[PDB]
Symmetry: C4
Subunit: 247 residues, 4 copies
């Protein structure tokens, strides 16, 4: 199963470099970054990852997507740890890549202080953090529902028995899906919708010196992007299957 | 006819979550929302709905589109109430979904006051409201003409006997059409162009506590996005058919 | 030849409604309009026009494109007046459509004064005007070169003997071409690149009451978007053919 | 080998006119230019170049892409000088084209002073310059890694034995790749990722009167966009091949 491991590693790495890089732009310089830039970077970063691993492993790049596909009987459970290990390694090294490419920008921006959110936050470049208007319950609800939207539309785009994207263009349409999840639903939680996108870079910032607060901030927010997308992806996939089965 | 009902429900729900979510971004935070974001959210939200229901029901997601297709002899009139019921239910629940996902943002933004438009409007997240420079007559004219543009281009994109989008890519091109209706024509009325997009979320805000003024504002504006698109879609479809019939 | 006349009329009308509408947004409200919006509106407005008329007339929507295709021996010269008449009529009525849809916005913006450019310009919604940093010679050079870029890339996108866009997707790629002509080259002259886009709406503003200065402004700028694109399109097409002929 | 020379010349010229034009917009007028505009201009400028030369020469438009393809045994080394000469000539003349089209804008902006970066920089319209927060080592690291990302994703998009873009749409997907390299990774060095994009326009500005400092600025930055992309493209291609070979 090293084939799927390496494909999930390579695709998740590529996707996360584009994703985290666009967030670094938005955080570090308003002249060269924006929330739309983040929407595009993660969105079409997913497109590139699909071209890398789509026909080798499926290019899940997302532990919740793998969980839903295994729990729904489309991928054997033995592949779940292989996929998630590949995703976690690729996303961790993507975080390390962005940190090194943007090192001087991060240091010039923060005055040398790796801040989680003081005068100048930088931990948010790598992982999601609850805005202060949000509660942890409503953050859980958002991450679950948004990952449900992801899984349902992922199925619709690739369902060969319904109305899929023309073969050879699914990577583009999937990318657009991730773009508008950010455009339409992302301001409330940073639309992590992906345990592999959120936890490995958070672990990196802890190792890189941002401190214990990358976990405890937002009322121990760190575990929600791990658990809520798992439930959301499964529920979104269930809803699509019940929908198609009824049609 | 439950097949088409469920497909219209699911596609309209998906489209409207992406649509209303992007408007919530634009209203509630200028850092994470913009009018272009709204153009993209509704536009490619339509793309996802087409993938859901396109080959089951046609993915009308729009009572005026269904009305024009029935009035032009392409869908039997018996399906009209089934389609519209599905669209209204999906769009109503999409409004309820956005309200719950953005609940704390709406409350933090408005100070707890569900305002239609006072110091901080929020009713406009869900339904269209006439800008003060507009008259109701010119608002009717806009909604009719814009829905006519929608129906004519919808026909052109999907006309297998003319120059359609390559099969398997129509969802993308249709989405782009809805993007630029917003980009080019949307500032005058909020380009409702869709009774199912406008009335069900307006009814939701009335039930949610925004009050009677969601209907009476803009000189009883509420009925125009219901009636004007019906006429516009029919006229736009008639013009395309007369155009092709003459060629 | 009424087939091609009606197709050029309908496609040019559709393209110009999307085009002029996006410029009206940019002029009249900075919250709902931008230069990128104009790039997208004209660009994907062209996409919709290609779906309307692409397989009936070729969807030239542009007198310079028709001139280059006739002068290069691809369309008989007898069709040239038929195409241009259709384009001029469609674009004129598109100008009339935008004026009526945006009438109250234009009146609220200008205080009731149809200004060419005083305190609040509105004539620029419909036709191009030289920025004050520009000379008429360099404006001629821009319109010629930009229309040359258009014609050369149009040929490359549709050349079945080279590397064309996949059939059924050319409308999208052509639209993107028009998007980036605006993004990359449009600030110097408004990238008219199209006599049918520029002169008919200029004539409309003269009839609508903007006055004689729609022609005499910019050192009699009005004739350059008519003549310079004709030369540019022909030269750009010649360069592509010499390029392919040499390969 | 004049076939490939002329194709590389024409495609690089087209790509660089769109690319440099969008940067001129961003530098010279904030109303009509933006960093996203630059991302789109270079990105879909690449799309047009691929349509020009994709099936004649491969539309490398990039000396590092040609170097990696020759060093990886996909193009004979005898074609390397032919490709690079064509790219350098096309990009040089594109710089000359932008300078002449934007001449009055450059003169009005700078007050007549061709400045590299004083009160009003304009040399950055044509070539990349290190931001002051950057070191030359980290600039080398960025240009190498970003060109590696380019080459790896280029291979993935066009790999007929893996999961490529549908034939006839690769130009679009490749363009999107170049868009998001700018969106996600471009603020640190201007993502030159291309010796043919950087050195010929830099040489033009030296000849045009910007002075010796176009080379010596940024601690002799000029050579890094020449050497670092060569190494990065080769390494990115090696990584993809080792990835696929292992799968």
């Amino acid at each position: 199963m090293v084939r799927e491991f390496l494909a999930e590693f390579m695709s998740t790495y590529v996707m996360m470099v584009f994703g985290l890089g666009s967030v670094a732009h938005m955080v570090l310089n308003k002249k060269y970054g924006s929330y739309l830039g983040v929407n595009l970077g993660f969105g079409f970063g997913v497109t590139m990852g699909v071209h890398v691993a789509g026909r080798i492993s499926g290019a899940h790049m997302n532990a919740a997507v793998t969980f839903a596909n295994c729990a729904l009987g489309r991928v054997p459970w033995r592949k779940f740890p292989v996929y998630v290990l590949g995703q976690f390694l690729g996303s961790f090294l993507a975080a390390a890549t962005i940190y090194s490419l943007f090192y001087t920008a991060i240091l010039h921006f923060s005055g040398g202080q790796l801040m989680v959110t003081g005068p100048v936050a930088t931990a948010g470049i790598f992982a999601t953090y609850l805005p202060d208007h949000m509660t942890l319950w409503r953050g859980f609800l958002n991450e679950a529902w948004l990952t449900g939207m992801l899984q349902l539309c992922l199925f619709a785009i690739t369902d060969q028995e319904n109305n899929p994207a023309l073969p050879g263009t699914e990577a583009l349409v999937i990318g657009i899906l991730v773009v508008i999840i950010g455009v339409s639903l992302g301001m409330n939680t940073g639309y992590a919708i992906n345990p592999s996108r959120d936890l490995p870079p958070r672990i990196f910032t802890f190792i890189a010196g941002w401190g214990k607060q990358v976990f405890s901030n937002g009322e121990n927010w760190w575990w929600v992007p791990v658990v809520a997308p798992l439930l959301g992806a499964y529920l979104g996939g269930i809803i699509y299957l019940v929908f198609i089965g009824s049609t």
